[PDB]
Amino acid sequence: TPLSATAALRDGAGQVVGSARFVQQGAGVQVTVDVRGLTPGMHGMHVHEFGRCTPGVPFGAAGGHFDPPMLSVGADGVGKASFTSTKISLTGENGILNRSLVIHANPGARERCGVIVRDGLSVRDYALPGPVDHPEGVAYDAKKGLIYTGSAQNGTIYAINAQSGAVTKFQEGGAYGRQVALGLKVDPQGRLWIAGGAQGTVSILTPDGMTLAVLETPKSPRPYINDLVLAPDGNFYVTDSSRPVIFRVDKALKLTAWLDLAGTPIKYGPGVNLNGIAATPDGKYLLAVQLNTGELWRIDLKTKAVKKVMDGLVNGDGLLLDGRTLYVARNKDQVVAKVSLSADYGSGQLVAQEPLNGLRFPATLAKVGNDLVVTQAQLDRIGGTPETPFKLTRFAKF
Ligand SMILES: [Cu+2]
């Protein structure tokens, strides 16, 4: 099934007066435009940054021209175009899904606008209320029907009712160990486990929203506790994307350095190293992705032996293991990758990469009922100018 998108082109009164169709063909996008009611001659036609066609001037809410192709309308006011472009894409870091197509007046004012909507793939966005939320980790409590997601900027955990979308503050951030929230997991007791980023902490909250414990790691320079996972053996394993160590938290809540990575094939370098982590359901292995190198690693829980599984996942962030299928959020690339794993988890093949309906720095993944949810963290905009509202996006497995 090809990657394609459609934009229903509206005029200022909100009437749909045309359509633009986009079909990905390798590196190029085939574009077809049909629109009526325009003045004869050549018209500027550009992608703008936001997928909104409401006033901001008419169509001002579309924002500026998207930069990281002229429409000719005959005497009857009908504009017709058909070309292939290598300057746009429906996927990757510069993909145009959920942006807008705007037609201008001169070869000028904005005369037509349409939101570019992915064909054949339904999604549900859950908007968050704050100006700097930067939701990073996500987890789901199926018994309560609540999605939890945490702010990488200030540590607040929001609870989202998965059916209604209603957002509440599960626990405000700011306390010791609670100033940053990255990877999240819900354990069988309904407790929320929270990776603490540069605080070097792992925090645990009970389902009432109260803190149970803040666990510290050793004080050494540049801690960055990134993500964690509960293995079948009952232990949590915790990645640090800056310090070459994997931590373990046992059932009694004792945190230890479990594997020193120096001298293993995992070589830490500049940037984000191990971050997403998963546990195989047979209890034999951890899988962890190294973002900066793009390498996926298998770690034997009994011997601590390390094996490379595959390469090609640069910018790989959160992991979600579903049998022999591994989903990998690739944050800069704005896609969710799908990996098929061998039976001993010793090799893998990258089989698909989904841009969904447009993603802004997707960071982590969780299962919600029969679906998946991904955070649009926009972490590349932290301290800068993110698009608001921040959102989580729920979508079918693939
Ligand atoms: Cu423009």
Structural domain spans, the chain: 4-118, 123-396
Nearest 10 degrees: Cα torsion 105, 106, 109, 113? 50
Residue type, 263: G
- CA 308 to the chain's CA centroid: 24
**Distance from C-alpha of 389 to C-alpha of 114, rounded to nearest angstrom:** 20
Cα distances from 41 to residues 9, 44, 134, 256, in angstroms, run: 18, 10, 45, 71
Instruction: Pull the structure tokens for residue 210.
Output: 């109260």
Q: Mark the residues whose beta carbon lies below 5 A from ion ligand 1.
A: 46, 65, 102
Contact predicate 90/3, CB 8 Å: yes
Q: Which residues contact 59 (CB under 8 A, 6 or more apart)?
A: 12, 53, 100, 102, 110, 113
Angle (nearest 5°) at CA 90 between 85 and 94: 90
Distance 110 CA to ligand 1 centre (A): 7
Q: What's the CA-to-centroid distance between 60 and ligand 1, angstroms?
A: 10
d(CA 175, CA 181): 12
Could you tell me the distance, in angstroms and rounded to a whole number, from the CA of residue 101 to the centre of ligand 1?
A: 8
SS3 label, residue 269:
coil
The DSSP code sequence of 83-118 is: EEESS--SSSTT--TT-EEEEES----EEEEEEEEE
Rg (the chain; Cα; Å): 23
Ligand 1: centre distance to CA 386 (Å): 21
Closest CA to 97 of 152, 22, 14, 148: 22
Residue 396 CA to residue 398 CA, distance in Å, equals 6
**Residue 11: C-alpha distances to residues 15, 47, 48, 117, 276 (Å):** 6, 16, 16, 17, 45
Ligand 1 centroid to Cα of residue 20, in Å, is: 16
DSSP 197: B
Left, alpha or beta for 358 (phi > 0: left; psi -120 to 50: alpha)? left
H or E element: which one contains 227? strand 225-230
Q: Do domains 4-118 and 123-396 have the same CATH topology?
A: no
> CATH homologous superfamily for 4-118?
Superoxide dismutase, copper/zinc binding domain (2.60.40.200)
Q: Are 165 and 158 in contact (CB under 8 A)?
A: no
Q: Which contacts (CB < 8 Å, 24+ apart) does range 368-373 have?
A: 368/140, 368/147, 368/162, 368/394, 369/142, 369/162, 370/396, 370/397, 371/395, 371/396, 371/397, 372/320, 372/327, 372/336, 372/396, 372/397, 373/126, 373/138, 373/140, 373/147
Measured CA angle at 137 (ends 181, 288), to 5 deg:
110
Q: Is 62 helix (H, G, I), strand (E, B) or coil?
A: helix
Between the CA of 49 and the centroid of ligand 1 the distance, in Å, is 9
Tokens found for residue 74:
């005959």
Taking the C-alpha atoms of residue 18 and residue 38, their distance in angstroms, rounded to an integer, is 11
Best CATH choice for the domain 123-396 from the list 3.40.50.720, 2.120.10.30, 1.10.8.60, 3.10.520.10: 2.120.10.30
Is residue 276 a contact partner of residue 316, using CB atoms and an 8 Å limit? yes
Structure solved via: X-ray
From the CA of 129, how far away is ligand 1's center (Å)? Answer: 29
CA of 316 to the centre of ligand 1 (A): 33
Residue 155 near residue 148, CB atoms below 8 Å: no
Report the distance separating Cα 221 and Cα 388, nearest Å: 34
CA distances from 107 to 10, 39, 140, 249, 261 (A): 20, 12, 51, 63, 59
Helix (H) or strand (E) holding 42: strand 41-48
CA distance 186 to 190: 6
Q: Is 26 exposed, middle or buried (0-12, 13-18, 19+ CB in 10 A)?
A: exposed
Give the full edge-to-edge strand order of the sheet including 285-290. 274-279, 285-290, 295-300, 306-310
Cα 5 to averaged position of ligand 1 atoms, centre (Å): 19
Round to whole Å and give the CA distance between 155 and 12. 41
